[PDB]
């Protein structure tokens, strides 16, 4: 399983 | 500074005429990820060659495997043909069954 | 932060309403909770992402619509008194210290008949002479009686300015008919100032109650005035005694 | 062996028409099990090893969702690193990411991993402590602050210790027959007249797993590193691996040469010679 | 799965200490815990988030926390408690991922009362409005060790105690209101149904 999505926002670079 | 691909061409099982086999071309160590790869039978291009999914090593350089099913005979010659952005001409490695 | 409309609502049994929730933080997740006395926050529905919904703990009578990534929606197709509650919308992240993850919450009362809706009567009682010469202080009392639902906001205004020091208001609205279901409410509040400040015939003390009732959309065909959202006040001037 | 699980993300901006391409592949040890490509007409996450296919549809819907979302974010990121460096949308650029967990003795996280690179050179990375970062350049430093204030590090650790370790164990049990097993090299030696007065000796290692191997030639007690020719370990294409080691020897004289292979499916380090 | 706050209502006077208990239940290895304050105002203000894999020591001025992962508890502690702390306190448990359900505790109401430095307990009658109608009884200046129970009567309304804080004076006072429109309702006999200081000043 890959790192699942956070509750919050998926932070970019 | 980019990185030029390495090329290895070889069969899956040890070569033996009239016996079913897979002819592999393995390209690695290159960056960026864009690469042209063809498999050649007697100078002609082999259509229907699947390839491995894109992945990369500890030093960020990519590697892919191109492969095909085939039945080798005594007369028939094969080669892997590669073209990458750091190459001015296609490279044409001939398959020697001893390498 | 996360916004939430409406803030207050009154409804008759059987009717619809959609509480709208909005989040601007680019969060994937959106949650709906009701709050009921000594029950904590119970989940209703949530949304993992855009165009996705999942039941919670109390999904009966509730429907949701995760519209886009910004907006969640809690829909009551048929109102029921057991849905009288405060509804909070939630969208948690990891930087809570400086981002608000909860809506202000929306107060909702579901009644049997809208003839139950009454605005508050407000009355100010002036400081006792006995107190003034005993303790050197002056206590005014604001009283808000006969209001239903218990959606109000009480506020003391001294000489045109809302004041917060010297002020205490009841924790929760009291019930006049604890027996009855639709019992109208009552609230009391207190403002204390020095005896001298009260003895000034220039000082103007106004108690202000904000009631949230019916709207323009709401029909009304009755003798007594339509119980709209409104401010009812009561005021006294200071006095030399 | 101390098992591990890795995920490799490749994001790549397009010079022509089209959106940046996001390819994800995952591995347990040296075995791929999952793939995802954003080019695929209706992009889905696909199995790549038999033992994964037992997982219910809920599992694959869960993966797709993750990668689809990651595609949109990595497109944002590219614009950003295009800016961080000040680069036109003429140039084509690559972000890579490589994250996973190594499984220690008490069946728990030995250490977690997360490294990002831009154009093949190191960009940012989570440290051993799993709470601080390493910015390699001034642009990477912009991300670090952003990632410190967003607290990415806290979400990363949560996964690496939590789910990563948990799921690797599920996979390690459900494909154990292949994953927990080491297939030894099938070795034979080879001879080819260079001259006239010389010949190559090729020491072969075929059909082995894992990729970890050590092929060295010896004339005496000292290594023939100068000059042994060693090729990169290569896939057979059936999930096994290949490698060879060569030296030029005088046609004397081949007798004096021993090959020495080291693996994990070999109890004793196997040693070979040429047989005429 | 479960978050328990066994405490319902709890009382302390100013400067005293309070520890609001909170216990959780999960089968999960990774998770984080919330603490939220709900003032008499309605809104929810963030106090602290804490990951399961963090440390144990958390002192942040007056508000302090102790997270014992082995005995599955997370306990909030206020030192030098102030009337301002008066709120309902929420413990909550959640997972890190979009699919995870944020689970709340039943809550705890903390009532911080003042340290009435000079009691002068008295009951007063407050004049008309004019037409009110027409009388209101105030009970004030008692210390925080006094309880205001409901009246037995049908139409005698009495509110629970309340904390004043005249700031500019640095003065605090408790108070209670009691009213009726009954013609016999006297402020001399309004608060009978309470255990109140027997030296309470009753002006006639």
CATH superfamily of the largest domain in chain E: Immunoglobulins
Supply the number of structural domains of chain E.
2
Main beta-sheet strand count, sense and barrel state of chain E: 6 strands, mixed
Number of strands of chain E: 17
Form type of chain E: elongated
| Separate helix tally of chain A | 0
- The helix-strand sequence of chain E is EEEEEEEEEEEEEEEEE
Rg of chain A is: 8 Å
Q: What class, by secondary structure content of chain E?
A: mainly beta
| Helix percent band of chain A | under 10%
Strand content of chain A: under 5%
Number of strands of chain A: 0
Number of helices of chain E: 0
CATH architecture of the largest domain in chain E: Sandwich
What is the CATH class designation of the largest domain in chain E?
A: Mainly Beta
Largest sheet of chain A: none
Q: Pair with the most extensive interface? A: C-E, 57 and 54 residues
Structural class of chain A: little secondary structure
Organism (chain D): Homo sapiens
GO cellular component, one term (chain D): MHC class I protein complex
Protein name (chain D): HLA class I histocompatibility antigen, B alpha chain
Membrane topology (chain D): Single-pass type I membrane protein
Keywords:
C: 241 residues; mainly beta; Immunoglobulin-like; 2 domains; five-stranded antiparallel β-sheet; 19 strands; globular; D: 276 residues; Murine Class I Major Histocompatibility Complex, H2-DB, Chain A, domain 1; eight-stranded antiparallel β-sheet; immune system; MHC; HLA; TCR; Disulfide bond
Structure report:
The complex is a heteropentamer of chains A (13), B (99), C (241), D (276) and E (204). With 13 residues, chain A is mostly loops. Chain A has no helix or strand. Chain B is elongated. With 99 residues, chain B is mostly beta strands. Chain B has a single domain (1-99), classed as Immunoglobulin-like. Chain B has strands spanning 6-11, 21-30, 35-41, 44-45, 55-56, 62-70, 78-84, 91-94. Chain C folds into 2 domains: 1-112, Sandwich (Immunoglobulin-like); 113-238, Immunoglobulins (Immunoglobulin-like). Chain C is 5% helix and 45% strand. Chain C contains 2 helices and 19 strands. Chain C has helices spanning 129-135, 195-198, and strands at residues 2-5, 8-12, 17-23, 30-35, 41-47, 54-55, 63-64, 71-76, 85-90, 106-111, 121-125, 137-147, 152-158, 161-163, 167-169, 174-175, 185-194, 204-211, 230-237. Chain D folds into 2 domains: 1-181, MHC class I-like antigen recognition-like (Murine Class I Major Histocompatibility Complex, H2-DB, Chain A, domain 1); 182-272, Immunoglobulins (Immunoglobulin-like, Sandwich), CATH 2.60.40. Chain D has an 8-stranded antiparallel β-sheet, with helices on one face. Classes of the chains: A little secondary structure (13), B mainly beta (99), C mainly beta (241), D alpha+beta (276), E mainly beta (204). Chains C and E meet through strand 5, strand 9, strand 11, helix 1 and strand 12 of C and strand 6, strand 10, strand 11, strand 13 and strand 14 of E. The PDB classes it as immune system.
